[PDB]
Amino acid sequence: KFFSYILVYRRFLFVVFTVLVLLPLPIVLHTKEAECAYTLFVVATFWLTEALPLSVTALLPSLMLPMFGIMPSKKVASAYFKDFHLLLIGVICLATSIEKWNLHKRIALKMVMMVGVNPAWLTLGFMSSTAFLSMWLSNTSTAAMVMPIAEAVVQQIINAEAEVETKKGHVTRKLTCLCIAYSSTIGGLTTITGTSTNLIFAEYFNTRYPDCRCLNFGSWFTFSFPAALIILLLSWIWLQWLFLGFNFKEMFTVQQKACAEVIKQEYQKLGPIRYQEIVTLVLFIIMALLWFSRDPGFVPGWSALFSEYPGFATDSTVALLIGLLFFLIPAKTLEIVAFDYSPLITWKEFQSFMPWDIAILVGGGFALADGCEESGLSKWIGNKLSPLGSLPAWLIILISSLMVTSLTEVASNPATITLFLPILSPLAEAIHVNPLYILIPSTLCTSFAFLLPVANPPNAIVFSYGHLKVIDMVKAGLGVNIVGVAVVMLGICTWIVPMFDLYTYPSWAPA
Amino acid sequence: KFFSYILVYRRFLFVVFTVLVLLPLPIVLHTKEAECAYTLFVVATFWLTEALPLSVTALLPSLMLPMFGIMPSKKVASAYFKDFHLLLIGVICLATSIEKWNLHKRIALKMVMMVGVNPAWLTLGFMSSTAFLSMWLSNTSTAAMVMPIAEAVVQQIINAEAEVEATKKGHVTRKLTCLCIAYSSTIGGLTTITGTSTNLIFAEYFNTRYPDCRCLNFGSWFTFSFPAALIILLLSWIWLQWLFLGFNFKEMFKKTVQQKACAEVIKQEYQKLGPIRYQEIVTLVLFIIMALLWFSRDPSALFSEYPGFATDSTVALLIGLLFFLIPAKTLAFDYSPLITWKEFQSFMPWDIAILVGGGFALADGCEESGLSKWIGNKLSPLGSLPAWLIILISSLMVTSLTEVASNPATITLFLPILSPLAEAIHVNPLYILIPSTLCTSFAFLLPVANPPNAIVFSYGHLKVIDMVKAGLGVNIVGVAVVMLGICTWIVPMFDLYTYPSWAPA
């Protein structure tokens, strides 16, 4: 009798139960830092299991932090719109222009005609291309720009699968989403400028250790490319096994010819390229080049033109500058010339197709991280990590790597690395084991945020495309994170200590 | 030829021309004040001319200020989201819950049954209800909540007239109702500190800059705002009913063959709605809980160690998020929470949020660039003119420049300029700040002036010339009434003639 009533209203009952069961944490402990811990636990629990919509959960910090007195409501609101949101708006303008004029369909059909009919090679090509392109621009930018093309490819293959005559389509869409999202292994690990975490680490190391000049482009790549490539290959294998099937003999039929014929027929139906598509392609190229030319790290960029106000113009300035141009560039004339022209995209079309839910979710994650920093919660974890000097070096490395890769779960990678570096470096120098030996694994594992969205902006951008099953993302991310941690361990043990000389105390380290 | 190509591409050519022609100012002056002034001029020109979408123009500060070097892009992005947006989200949840479950039509039909079918009495009732709601709710939230109900009212009125007969008058009535809601929202907002974010910003600025002064509170603000608000509301109602429908003398005070038929058909519509059911009542309960907490918690008294941490936006979020988990319908056997995030997303004015954030960022860049100090220095020699002429000029300037920028942005821009000016002329700071704060809310000429105007104009019944014609008269009436109130009754209560002890010498 009552069992059915409990089963039907499981979400409401679970929400109430998890609010009340963690309630003793604030009242007990004299209300010191368990309030922010309780807020984080409740929000994370609601994020793991779909008790509430993800954006509704992201709005919870705006309730909990002000009432607990951790930080004022004005500051919590100010934390909801950040630089990433301007970047997202700028990129979404371009994405709307791409999809409205069927440029994505044309690119997808051309790519399918060229190579990649087999799903395994298609996924491998997506991962390799996204990983290579993310070497230079950013994780967020590349994950945002290459995702529409992959979605178009998958949609076109699904449409052509009819062959003049399902469960496979959605699982392939999830696999494509995850492989685009998880292609952070090359995008930032390999190059110092690839990710934010790697610029912050380099700046901190140079400031704290001016004598050591080993960290530069062409030396980060040497020790980081093998590990990142191994992670990429193993993650591709793991994703191809988890979703769909893996057969060794298949990678090592008339349906393929029928699909190729359908794809060719559709491509011919597209016809010659249009003016709007040409303009959109040119603006895409200009945006990508401007992102690449901000600060390559080996040659001066255009930021040297502004070499008086450093850090003022970020990637989002480029995104906005090239995206707002879509609202004023003429697309069609209303040759009657009745009233005026029309823009490439109108605000009506931009309001839709905009991931407002993703913006709210990332804002909520930012607010939660800021609330954790404001209270003595992150500092508490860092101070708990400090008294491990008596432990062996490898155990210290493993504990630090796991703690960093699990604390970047709910906080942005730059915030986690900026928090942990001042904590680890005195700990590294307390023992005589080569502070790089402990700094490298932590900064490598900080970017391994493959679990849940909002942890990494690429994850949220990919999550924006409707395949909102968090449990699948968690299942894939656990394996990818384990693979990444294992490969980082193997690299520290094998490849990195020859060139960085991580076994003995260096001269540049303080005595 | 050339002329036809210029005529078709008006907006593109105008945008390029305005960007290029004002470039001499930053190129020659080489000062941060000039660059901020250039950004202000470009944004204002695009807002009046509407060459670019209002949100697209609002995003221009985040592209211009970082490039000019005024402040980093991170600060500009941080300036786009404030407590007003949290309040807006919290109240849009409730508005979505009201509209989805057909509560707006029920309230509309009950109101029509109560106050008959005469358009002027309906307009009076709408203005009174909107003012009462905006006394506690923000003007944007008040408009978003109220406007669907009046849309239902007018749609039912034209339906009844068409069926009884079996139009231009109905279109005029819809225009008048939209304008009256848009104005009355702000008119009610002027009454209280929490009615508008403009009053909250002014109050916090006055408290921070003048800690010694403790005059401002709910009671004082109500005492010197209620008479002016009532007079302005009544005169604006008279102006609106004279403009569109035409004035009446005695037929207004005082059944017609069509009247009983319309009442009857409204009655059958009301029974066609059916008895009140679930997915309602709970909406009313949550709304009255929101209002009760709004005028009970903040009249606090429970969170004393943290004063000002929890505000009306916290209560709005607390009540609104309950619309995402309370079950509505059975069936996976998972229930329905009375709102799906898709429904909230297709109701939330994201463009309004971006526009207000852009205004906030532009104002913040205005203080950071130092342009506000330059404006205050240039306005300092106003001491020669009498105090009444000084306040008249200040109020006229504020109400003229509030038609382009949002009310909170305008007030937060002008407070750091006006407050030192009051101290310089050795005059009571309140004597200058209060009229300016009251006249800041008088933004009626354009949809960009305040978000309620944009919400009203979004329905497409109104057009810009009618809004301008009504807003000019309402603004004149408001300025005159505010000046009269300052001259007559506010001074005896506040002793504004003498220089206060809290103000620096």
Ligand code: NA
């Ligand atoms: Na990257």
Ligand code: NA
């Ligand atoms: Na993270």
Ligand code: NA
């Ligand atoms: Na305004």
